Ligand binder design. Structure first.
Ligand SMILES: *[C@@H]1O[C@H](CO[C@@H]2O[C@@H](C)[C@@H](O)[C@@H](O)[C@@H]2O)[C@@H](O[C@@H]2O[C@H](CO)[C@@H](O)[C@H](O)[C@H]2NC(C)=O)[C@H](O)[C@H]1NC(C)=O
Ligand SMILES: *[C@@H]1O[C@H](CO[C@@H]2O[C@@H](C)[C@@H](O)[C@@H](O)[C@@H]2O)[C@@H](O[C@@H]2O[C@H](CO)[C@@H](O)[C@H](O)[C@H]2NC(C)=O)[C@H](O)[C@H]1NC(C)=O
Ligand SMILES: *[C@@H](O)c1ccc2cccc(OCCCN3CCN(CC#C)CC3)c2n1
Ligand SMILES: *[C@@H]1O[C@H](CO[C@@H]2O[C@@H](C)[C@@H](O)[C@@H](O)[C@@H]2O)[C@@H](O)[C@H](O)[C@H]1NC(C)=O
Ligand SMILES: *[C@@H]1O[C@H](CO[C@@H]2O[C@@H](C)[C@@H](O)[C@@H](O)[C@@H]2O)[C@@H](O)[C@H](O)[C@H]1NC(C)=O
Ligand SMILES: *[C@@H]1O[C@H](CO[C@@H]2O[C@@H](C)[C@@H](O)[C@@H](O)[C@@H]2O)[C@@H](O)[C@H](O)[C@H]1NC(C)=O
Ligand SMILES: CC(=O)N[C@H]1[C@H]([C@H](O)[C@H](O)CO)O[C@@](O)(C(=O)O)C[C@@H]1O
Ligand SMILES: *[C@@H]1O[C@H](CO)[C@@H](O)[C@H](O)[C@H]1NC(C)=O
Length: 526
């Protein structure tokens, strides 16, 4: 099976899936390798080739620091890259149904990982099940992360910022110019992503250069207005200069800093990224999106507030326990290996870990709003409060606020609350419905009966997959055949959302109302 693309022919491979076939094209390049003088620059267009490019294996993942906090543990290592790290990493994957479709809707996955980690080749991002079950085409790409993807000297084309977001965009461009040759409809393209991938999706809704490259958007546990998602121009320069100091690249001609940073090995850049700030937290994003004047024309909170974004349907949601995953990367008293019951003093110490540059008053106000107990003698009170602090501040309330503000300009929005803990979840039970552990349900992994998921999980995934596909194809995330709960539109007044679980799919209103009034309306003042 050979497909003629605009840059040359590519050969794929056949896959057996659920008694059927899916054609996979793993590792198609979509840009010149950003090497040498191209390091830190926007991705450059790809020159034609005259042979057959062999798209039969995942390509290199982009350079990044690896999680080494729990070596050997599947709960952390399932997120580490599973192909070679290299600056030569601008490749993408395509799964197409067999027989080749006629005008298939296209799903484009953008992975998360805090803009500093991630890769399209992870097992939980394998698009072959969606192509098999729903006959959509699934595209995913690698994009640069960390300083190599987001180092910013505003205005300087040698390091303009947002390079990794331009990587994503050049790949959406690739789908526009090429996907019809695979049987895809370039006019029916839905971006979806999780965590920083969702923040990326939300930023593509804002970027005028992305508006004609997709139709609809899905945002899983992430949005650009989350406190970790956008770096200010002030911090970005301070961090670029700090990186230069730590590498001996300090100059005065700012372009000379970049040239010096271009001769450093990826490792030396990587090992210094952590220290460009004085106080880090487990949620630090030292090198991420900025207002560059190119991808992002203004501070995105202003664009959202004033209606300057692509008018289309969105599907947004969050998981019950977004925050807990980050407590074992720093908060005192927490461990994946015990029940992590903490004291009031440990909670207080945890606030200092997560809100280091916040006034004593600000930190008191968090404690005040999250420690008025329904039972002062319940021992896990402080353990659960800190998880809720971190998840509400960093994920849930920004997603809800994004959805409110987006829906106020007339478009249909749909909001979900994912609350099923995977039966295979390797992390301990006190961490609950963790950040990122809906992804396998979205990609349909529980549909493989060989994988030790329960039967209730197979059916939950099956319904989620149908709802996602119906959203991509038709703008409406319903499951219309198996007498399902109808998913109502999220409006700013009633704020209805759908809960996703194995037991009862219910309609609820005003998720985390009191908590989010604190984070969205009071805490930005402190
Ligand atoms: C790209 O692939 C072609 C086709 O071979 C395919 O890939 C192999 C890994 C194997 O799985 C085959 O069954 C597939 O059909 C390669 O063509 C081969 O090229 C070598 C050297 O030119 C030649 O000795 C073989 O006879 C060719 N055919 C086969 C069936 O192997 C081609 O070389 C690949 N391009 C590369 C490696 O750059
Ligand atoms: C839960 O564990 C944390 C983490 O401690 C590590 O992991 C444990 C499972 C065990 O193997 C310890 O030996 C490890 O140090 C405990 O936090 C530590 O508690 C000790 C108690 O003396 C203290 O000296 C350390 O400073 C703590 N370290 C950190 C990083 O918090 C915690 O006490 C355990 N709690 C419960 C309820 O089991
Ligand atoms: C998701 O993209 C996201 C959002 C914010 C943020 C901030 C800092 C660091 C981040 O990623 C760190 C990667 C570690 N992460 C890997 C997965 N682990 C288990 C789970 C789920 C927990 C931590 C970051 N990422
Ligand atoms: C493919 O379809 C085009 C129509 O575009 C799409 O219709 C639905 C699927 C929406 O999701 C939205 O993307 C568009 O309205 C046709 O114009 C085109 O000719 C068709 N091409 C082929 C080869 O079938
Ligand atoms: C801006 O940068 C100042 C200088 O950073 C210092 O040197 C670099 C290499 C790192 O090692 C960093 O830890 C040092 O502090 C900071 O002192 C200053 O606090 C920064 N500004 C803000 C608001 O964080
Ligand atoms: C819908 O359910 C299918 C199997 O369930 C059977 O068929 C439906 C129509 C009802 O009659 C039910 O009582 C039966 O047990 C699944 O094979 C199919 O994947 C499901 N589809 C979705 C989108 O969830
Ligand atoms: C940097 C990198 O990943 N390089 C290459 C790898 C490895 O160098 C070798 O497998 C030995 O490690 O091998 C390939 O050539 C191959 O034939 O699949 C592909 C890839 O370009
Ligand atoms: C910095 O160096 C570049 C490349 O040599 C040059 O074009 C530019 O004019 C220089 N600017 C200053 C202020 O030295």
């Amino acid at each position: 099976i050979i497909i003629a693309t605009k840059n040359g022919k590519v050969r794929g491979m056949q896959l057996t899936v659920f008694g059927g076939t899916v054609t996979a094209f793993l590792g198609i390049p979509y840009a010149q390798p950003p090497l040498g003088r191209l390091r830190f620059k926007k991705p450059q267009s790809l020159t034609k080739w005259s042979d057959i490019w062999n798209a039969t294996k995942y390509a290199n993942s982009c350079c990044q620091n690896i999680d080494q906090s729990f070596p050997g543990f599947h709960g952390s290592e399932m997120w580490n890259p599973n192909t070679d790290l290299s600056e030569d990493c601008l490749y993408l994957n395509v799964w197409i149904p067999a027989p080749k479709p006629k005008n298939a809707t296209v799903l484009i996955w953008i992975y998360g990982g805090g803009f500093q980690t991630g890769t399209s080749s992870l097992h939980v991002y394998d698009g072959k099940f969606l192509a098999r079950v729903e006959r959509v085409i699934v595209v995913s790409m690698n994009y640069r992360v960390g300083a190599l993807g987001f180092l910013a000297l505003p205005g300087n084309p040698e390091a303009p910022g947002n390079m990794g977001l331009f990587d994503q965009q050049l790949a959406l461009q690739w789908v526009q110019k090429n996907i019809a040759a695979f049987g895809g409809n370039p006019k029916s393209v839905t971006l979806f992503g999780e965590s920083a991938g969702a923040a990326s999706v939300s930023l593509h809704l804002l970027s005028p250069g992305s508006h004609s490259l997709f139709t609809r958007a899905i945002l899983q546990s992430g949005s650009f207005n989350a406190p970790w998602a956008v770096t200010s121009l002030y911090e970005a320069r301070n961090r670029t200069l700090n990186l230069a100091k730590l590498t001996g690249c300090s100059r005065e001609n700012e372009t000379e800093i970049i040239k010096c940073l271009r001769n450093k090995d990826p490792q030396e850049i990587l090992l210094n990224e952590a220290f460009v700030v004085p106080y880090g937290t487990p949620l630090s994003v030292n090198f991420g999106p900025t207002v560059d004047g190119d991808f992002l024309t203004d501070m995105p909170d202003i664009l959202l507030e004033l209606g300057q974004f692509k008018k289309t349907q969105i599907l947004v949601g969050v998981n019950k326990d977004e925050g807990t995953a980050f407590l074992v990367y720093g908060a005192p008293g927490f461990s994946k290996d015990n029940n992590s019951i903490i004291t009031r003093k440990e909670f207080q110490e945890g606030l200092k870990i997560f809100f280091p540059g916040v006034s004593e008053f600000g930190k008191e106000s968090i404690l005040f709003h999250y420690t008025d107990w329904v039972d002062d003698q319940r021992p896990e009170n402080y353990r659960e409060a800190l998880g809720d602090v971190v998840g509400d501040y960093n994920f849930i309330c920004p997603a809800l606020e994004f959805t409110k503000k987006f829906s106020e300009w007339g478009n249909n929005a749909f909001f979900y609350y994912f609350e099923h803990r995977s039966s295979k979840l390797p992390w301990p039970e006190w961490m609950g419905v963790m950040h990122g552990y809906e992804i396998e349900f979205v990609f349909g992994l529980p549909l493989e009966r060989r994988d030790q998921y329960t039967k209730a999980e197979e059916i939950l995934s099956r319904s989620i997959v149908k709802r996602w596909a119906n959203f991509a194809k038709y703008g409406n995330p319903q499951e219309t055949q198996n007498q399902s709960t109808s998913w109502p539109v999220f409006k700013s007044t009633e704020q209805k959302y759908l809960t996703l679980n194995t037991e009862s799919t219910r309609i609820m209103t005003k998720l985390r109302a009191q908590q989010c009034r604190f984070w969205t309306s009071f805490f930005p003042k402190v």
